[model samples]
Target: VPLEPWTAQQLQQATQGYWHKDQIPQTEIKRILTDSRHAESGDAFLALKGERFDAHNFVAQVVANGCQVAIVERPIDAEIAQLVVADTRLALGQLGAYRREQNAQLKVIALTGSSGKTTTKEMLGSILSRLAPTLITRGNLNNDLGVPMMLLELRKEHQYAVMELGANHQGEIDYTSKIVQPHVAGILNIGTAHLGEFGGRDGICRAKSEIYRHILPQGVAIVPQQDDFTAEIREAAKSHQIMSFGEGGDVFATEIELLPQSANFQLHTPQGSSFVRLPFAGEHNVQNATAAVAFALALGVSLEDIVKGLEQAQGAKGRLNFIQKAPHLFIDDTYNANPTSMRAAAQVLLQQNGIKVMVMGDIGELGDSSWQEHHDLGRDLAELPLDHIVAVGQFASAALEGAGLHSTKLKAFQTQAEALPFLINLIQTHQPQSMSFLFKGSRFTHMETLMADLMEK
Candidate 1:
């Protein structure tokens, strides 16, 4: 109900579409939903095209339930009133962008990078919430369609908007950049995550740098001082004012505390010093926290509220989170993995009491670099004081061998399917006793399946 009813003439004029104004009736959009089941009364349901399923085919069901109108790309049965557009994707983006400009007072911040984008968005949102009402990107909804969907959810009640912009192709970030036009921007680190499709590291840097491509000259650019590859990106963004936050940077930490479970540090700025403690444990997260602090500072958030938000962010699920079922502890870092995140998780496993066992899975999307990067992680594991290392996946075989596992200390499995049984037996055997396990892998690698089976009901 936040939006006013637009006559077909107004929508056509704003979107510059070919549809005749009189072809569609004048109606107000009370709600917008993609899922057919969630279509409430007076909702204008958007039937998005998906890889496995076509939402347009479900237009009948949406109308049958209480939806009064539907947006369709192709011609469909007349079970409901429809708005036929040449491309629903383009229309959605145009509409979202148009709506965003209507909020004259809302401060927009768009963040992107190869890793830690979601986590930083979450942290930044928490910090901004202390000062004013804020709306943040939910989960991994940083892609093309997802970005627009998130924007459409914004209302007049929101005072601040934070979005996580992600990309794989060259023009993806630039496309999203034009839509958000954020007043403040942050790029965590540019690694070789999606190098296979985009060519190589140079390709990734170019794509990630696109986030700053559309940033106005008056806007502020925030870059990490720790990443060497991303350093060049900062130099190229000289047109806009730049801010740095990390070790040996302009705004950094003095009394740094690197703990196994949580990290504490004192942020050093030209203005003054402030104490900060993040609930999550990892050195990489300290880097993420620094980026968040610098971004909040750019927005003029007070140092006291910044520290409080970092402490309040308990930590997102499956990203260096811990679940304790009495005597047993399950470290559920099973969300996703890369070279940077994998090593951080291993170091956390070495810090706890009782026997230290690491249940690892493959670090996905490495392409030709998988072998060398996996080997580096394996060698790092050998140097640590771990009781045993359990690996499951094809790439993990090279990792296990490179770790130089002594007879009884190392074990490798061909697939997650075969390895899960042994993991269950180990956990159940000592259910009433004490054991600590760390699970790490990519999302599609089925690490969570193994995690759910072994933990308590």
Candidate 2:
């Protein structure tokens, strides 16, 4: 069973809240939900208030739908059972903590960083699932509400839960990590993804390092070796056992080869050595694979299974996906981009044997350095061997000015619609030449749709 049957008396004791103490029903709660729509016969419904709406108003509806109990912040006149608390959100988190304590044996591995959090979580899930019944964070469900929901899913059958934790402000990771209380944790490289919200790179590092706060005493911290903030992450995780990856760690990789669609490397661990073939592009992805390796080894997964898992790995969509449309090869790294990821995508594009084309867009959440960063990217492109450049969105003009290239070799558009025809004609004109297009942009740019349109035609 996922959740043990909980009586209202037990829940009242766990949440330290009020129910009609004597009127509390003996019915057991088998499920918990924040959304009233998901309420079932024996579910405990939490009435949470948000910036735009309050779920408290739906208590009667859920109770009518057979909800066994309602956890709410305000008074409800319904006859059905209710547990009153000061804050439903906090109460929800408390219940998650209660469930976590109940499943103390569940191996939870939490990961966070500026970029590659989701990708690394996927890689880790791929490896862990081979040996156990593993649960991974679904999509971008790594926020405050999301983490609590993931934690509440613990069941008797699950052996491992590999979850991704993310944050946009200070203390967010600290808040969510306590809910997960991971047995194994990871801090991917700290970058400038939410730099504006965190104030600076140092602030970003502090925010990302919060994942180390609640790791179990017997747990392991998997970290990147020789990163700019490795020392900070290590110090934050001082009390826990440390396992490192990359060039300078207890576990590292050698004989690395980056191919058009995969990365092959020799994984060197204290246990033994194994050749890992990761089916993805970019050296950054190779680094991601190594982090997965460290965690797999820590969890007692065999090296043989690790290699097989790595070979089966597939790159997440819009994150360096390799697409071949007969005459054209497109690397859709357009899911999201910051300076580091953009450069990594460009480097991947440079490796292809073709007429290189970079379809670029503005990066978001850069704070004050947005203009200078975009210009610097343009200047860097000028130094590269790329054949043509297509710049889109508000920052296009700034990037074009910085490229130091003649007007004929560069095309600048104020929007994606404006750039569509020019890009289509460029591809049609170069139809005979082996051509490759790299799409790099932040989420707001919606650059992936352009690739969808191209594929459709």
Candidate 3:
């Protein structure tokens, strides 16, 4: 990565008449960081203000870590070189934009939605990299602080950049998008995931649509063809070319086959049709792949690259990922959950070949719908045929009761800890009877702990 030495004008622009009369030497800073341990020699540390603590307190620590300079909101007495700005966070964003403007060849794609934002980012990066050197948002760097840090990673070598923009509250999408100003923008689908934060689903739609609110008239907008909420965004994007992908849509997938182990579907892009058989499980992934293909096609990538990229694709650590160990199978889709995604995961489990058992933990941050949504998940359960349902956590108790999920064999546990020993006995003593196990929960539930323990003993 080429680090542009900060120019005199750039430094002047960052701080408005804030520095001493003696000009700081124009230095091409090689690194930028918020943490002291990762600070390298010649690195400029931004003592950013964060949730619990002020990074400004770490100026001396960073200098000791070999950091040459630090950016602060106020002057510091430490021996380390310091640059003061009105706000370090704002300065970070401004410097990032200046860095991007200096490099004229970068093509940026910004993505946001209620669900699947990060997965789509990973998928898009795979396809775009085949055509051009690409850089993607690390993890889910689609937020206020993350967006600028992500951009700082960008350099002249990268021809394309894909970022995942997340919003749980109003004005977040517009705020971040204005800084990044994507070459192409996409809003996957708005859901009730953050219904409480925004007051209702309508507000959620308005917040997410902010992604396209800042797209330049010359930029492109990609919306899901089947999504009810994003159609409004497509209508607003009249000045820009809009592409849609999904069911009952323009660019779509047909011949979808969801199996116990893998899913294969033929993508019908405007350019042509190509089949992608992903090693990952779940029907929802087909939807995630649709968004990826839509963005890739808009960028003029070949169908061959799109198919090949997905064929070799693997999603983030905990997204509907299926882990197979002989007769045992673990569906580790416990990353995060919304009503739609939960249903899609259940649908995949329903299609599995063996006698399957579903272990459900709680869904977090449901607001008023927490109980009703848990009850609704039971309705999805009632429609499926599985050997046994093991409901873990107190929230899932509502699901079991609502579904009337009872039999001589059905079981429910108040906690994963309470349930594990019994589950292990069943797995160890019983034949597993060609059983496939699905482990799903919110991050707070720590459902992966059970999967790891099961694998351990």
Candidate 4:
């Protein structure tokens, strides 16, 4: 429903495309959508082709659905308007950048990291949205297509944008960040989230540093003071103003309290300090808050608004969403996982009251280090005071093997159904007293099913 640059001449310029029609239609373009189901009159259908399926085939369907125009790689035999481009993907980015340029008054902040990007973005949204209307990235739309799609959602009325940039390999962040060209760029932390693609944590640090590459001269870069790549991240942002987050950083936390369901901390930022009762738990989350605080500080958000935002911020679904089923409490941190996030979730699980338990599944994209990463997690969780560690899927046994002497304390199951019986028994054995069960895994794992089955009627 956002208006502006509706003429074919501008879209042609924005997308760097040529119209199939020698005479352009006078109809103004109203919106753009990738899904044929939503394509309609005045909507530009951008066909996206992937390895599994090609959306180009859906061009006919979109036309049938009354779509106004088509952005495609190849010319199609259709009466509907068509715009030809070298790459529809790059065209999408161009259009997104074009839309971004339309909103000159919008203050944008883009962040990238191996871990905690989502949570930190959420917290930053809390602070920014408190001041004015803000556009925050939804779900995992932080990649090439996803980033452009989010940018297209921008409106002139929006004063701020909090974009979460994600990547598995090198130059991925570079491409997305350049399209964003945000005023404040933040790197939350360098962790082993995508070890296989980047090869290691060092590679991830390099990838995350790409967010700083596109910041305007007046823009600022936010880095973690305590990160292993602090020096390197700082060097990457040396050309711009730099702000630090984490212990002893420009924005740091004191008097930390990691409650079972949330955390209370004294947040100190360059702007000022405030007591923040963040509606989330875990020391890692506190760090995430500080990152958010640093971003807010860099953007000139008031300390009071920052504290208010921190208190009201909501986390994404399946990331530490706690629910109670009477004597048993289920913790869902299954938004996604890697060894670092897994350990952070485990440490928070360790602090909860009652017979604490963790049921995890195999992490994806670990590449050749899959077995070793699973083994390392198993060893790490076993060393904690957690009551039991149940690992599911193919890496289940590898985790058990790494548990060694604690293998007896660990349960390995190939599926949630197989893991259910033992989980139910453990729940029943603890009976009248409360018990906390933490479920976590990567995107493909869908480990929330374990809790769904357990809580079934």
Question: What TM-score goes with each of the models?
Answer: 0.87, 0.85, 0.87, 0.90
Predictions: Cα RMSD each = 3.4, 3.6, 3.2, 2.8
Where's the lowest-lDDT run of ten residues in candidate 3? 16-25
lDDT of 4 by residue, 106-133 (tens): 8989998867888899988878887888
In candidate 1, where is summed lDDT lowest over 10 consecutive residues?
A: 17-26
User: Candidate 2 has which clashing residue pairs, if any?
Assistant: none
Residue 211 in candidate 1, Cα distance off native in Å: 1.6
Q: For each candidate, what is the lDDT?
A: 0.76, 0.81, 0.76, 0.85
Runs off by more than 4 Å, candidate 1? 1-27, 36-40, 50-54, 193-199, 366-383, 393-407, 413-421, 428-432
Residue 124 in model 1: shift from native, Å? 0.7
Assess the local accuracy of residue 281 in candidate 3 as a C-alpha lDDT between 0 and 100: 71
Worst 10 residues of 4 by lDDT: 191-200
Local accuracy of candidate 1 as per-residue lDDT tens digits, 1-457: 3644445554455456543233464566666568888886677777788679888878878778877676667667665656667777887787678767777688888888887887788788888888887888887878887787787777777888998998856889889878887888867887764554546777777777778776755788888787866568787577788887787766787676878788888888755787877786866677788888888887788788888898888567678788777676789999888777777777788787676778888888887877787676777775678766777788877776677645356677778667777776665655655777899998878787777766734
1 against 2, candidate with superior TM-score: 1
lDDT string, candidate 3, 1-457, tens digits: 6654664446557545254334363565676778867876778787788789898877777777777677778888766666778888888887776666666798888898877888888888877887777888887666888887888777778899897888757888788888887888988887764333535877777777777777765777888777767567677666678888888766788999877667888888778887778766766678989888888877777888888888888788778777888877787877766566666676677777676777777887776677888876775575477666677777766676667534323466787678888688777656646667777778888888877887787
What number of clashing residue pairs does each candidate have, in the order they appear?
A: 0, 0, 1, 0
Compared with the true structure, model 1 gives a TM-score of 0.87
lDDT tens digits by residue: candidate 2, 1-457: 3665677776787689898444586778887788899897888888999999999888888978877688888778886778888988888778877777777668888898776788888888888777788888877878888887777777767788888888856899888889888888878788754433536878878887888889887888888786898888788888889899888797788899988778888888877898877888767778888888888887878888887888887767788888888878988888898877777777788888789988988888677777888888887875688888888888888787777755456677888777888877887787678888899899999888876676676
Candidate that scores best on TM-score: 4
What's model 4's TM-score? 0.90
